[PDB]
């Protein structure tokens, strides 16, 4: 079709199994890195607390609040607070969440991410809503209360990336493999008796031809073809982690040209 | 009859309150079970 290619093997809300083909390994790897580290996300980044009567310490809770995945779809039309022009934050650069909780029941009272509520103005963009994949739709269990246990605090979510803190990581693990029959000899198999018997074949062995021993070693060879799998925490839909990563990386490689030019 | 000083009590000894105390008694007593 063009340059590097894709074939998708499976797909879900939160998992894209696919095959990169016709590419530099370095490239395939860079995408991997970018996807993990540099795609922007919204996460709570400041927490002012009015009341806490919990067994959990202020900051202990604060920390958890950073880890709740927030809707980061239209994140690119929210500004980095660092560049926005207000002193501190505004509606242009941040989402304000609010959490009030009180142990009404006798039985233990649960504080879930669903109990967040956006106070700031969204200017109608997909943003800030806590991700809920939960079966009963409660999301992350933030904290537990008994009776006079009250939790009253306020959250300011900002745009950011994993390089600055992992809370901003749109993707979880990323599966990455190549050359499942070690035909490039890029690894030397440890063994007790039989390198073949001790080491398990990968699923992807089915997707390349077995090497067939009556064959001279191909030194000409080179790694193209990469079996990947991206998994999204949910703040951004899987496909977008792939794309945005591709895009994010490109923007980088671009900024280089651009500096090359102000030079 | 007469008073003769004070004996420090080992916790959970026969003479200590916590000896006969129950789990919820303790939690209520601010004492880790």
């Amino acid at each position: 079709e063009e340059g590097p290619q894709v074939k998708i093997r499976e797909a879900s809300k939160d998992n894209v199994d696919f095959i990169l083909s016709n590419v530099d390994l370095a490239m395939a790897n860079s995408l991997r890195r970018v996807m993990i580290a540099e795609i922007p996300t919204l996460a709570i980044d400041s927490v002012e607390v009015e009341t806490n009567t919990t067994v959990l310490a202020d900051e202990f809770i604060a920390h958890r609040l950073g880890l709740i995945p927030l809707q980061s779809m239209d994140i690119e039309q929210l500004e980095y607070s660092r560049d926005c022009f207000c002193e501190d934050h505004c509606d242009k650069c941040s989402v304000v969440l609010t959490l009030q909780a009180f142990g009404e029941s006798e039985s233990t009272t649960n504080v879930y991410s669903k109990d967040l509520v956006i106070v700031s103005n969204l200017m109608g963009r997909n943003i800030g809503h806590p991700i809920i994949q939960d079966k009963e739709g409660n999301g992350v269990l933030i904290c537990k209360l008994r009776k006079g246990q009250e939790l009253k605090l306020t959250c300011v979510a900002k745009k950011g990336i994993a390089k600055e803190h992992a809370k901003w990581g749109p993707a979880a693990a990323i599966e990455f493999e190549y050359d499942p029959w070690n035909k490039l000899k890029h690894t030397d198999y440890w063994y007790e008796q039989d390198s073949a018997k001790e080491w398990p074949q990968s699923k992807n062995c089915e997707y390349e031809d077995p090497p067939n021993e009556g064959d001279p070693f191909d030194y000409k060879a080179q790694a193209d073809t990469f079996y990947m799998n991206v998994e999204s925490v949910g703040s951004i839909p899987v496909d977008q982690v792939v794309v945005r990563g591709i895009d994010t990386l490109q923007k980088k490689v671009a900024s280089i040209l651009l500096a090359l030019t102000q030079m | 009859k007469v008073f003769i000083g004070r004996l420090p009590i080992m916790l959970r000894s026969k003479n200590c309150y916590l000896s006969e105390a129950t789990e919820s008694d303790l939690y209520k007593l601010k004492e880790c079970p």
Partner: protein, 132 residues
């Protein structure tokens, strides 16, 4: 990770690996001098003494205490106390340390003295020279 040291996953640390709470509890009281010559839990200023700690007294309420919620650090004064003479005794936070006032406790010595304990929480996050 050469020679009995290790590499640790930063991403993991963020996500909360190996973090710890840490608490220290400072303590004090007013010591009577026989004939009711006593000390005092209070926030002092200048006034004929001039002999007092060189860090912020301003975190103090009027009972010479901090309310628990405030960030402290440096030699911020965590407790205010005074002595007379015929007009300081205040307890600054450990110079090296910093944190948040966590619980403050006002009570009586078996005698009848104003007896006070001030706890301070800090979170410690796995950093480079940390041992495991």
């Amino acid at each position: 990770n050469q020679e009995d040291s290790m590499i640790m996953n930063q991403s993991s640390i963020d996500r909360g690996l190996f973090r710890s709470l840490f608490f220290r509890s400072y303590m004090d009281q007013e010591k009577k001098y026989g004939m009711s010559i006593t000390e005092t839990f209070e926030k002092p200023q200048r006034t004929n003494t001039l002999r007092m700690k060189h860090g912020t007294y301003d975190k103090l309420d009027d009972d010479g205490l901090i309310a628990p919620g405030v960030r402290v650090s440096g030699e911020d004064v965590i407790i205010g106390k005074t002595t007379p003479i015929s007009s300081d005794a205040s307890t600054p936070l450990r110079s090296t340390e910093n944190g948040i006032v966590d619980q403050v406790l006002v009570t009586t010595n078996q005698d009848g003295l104003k007896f006070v304990k001030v706890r301070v929480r800090t979170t410690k996050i796995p950093q480079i020279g940390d041992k495991f």
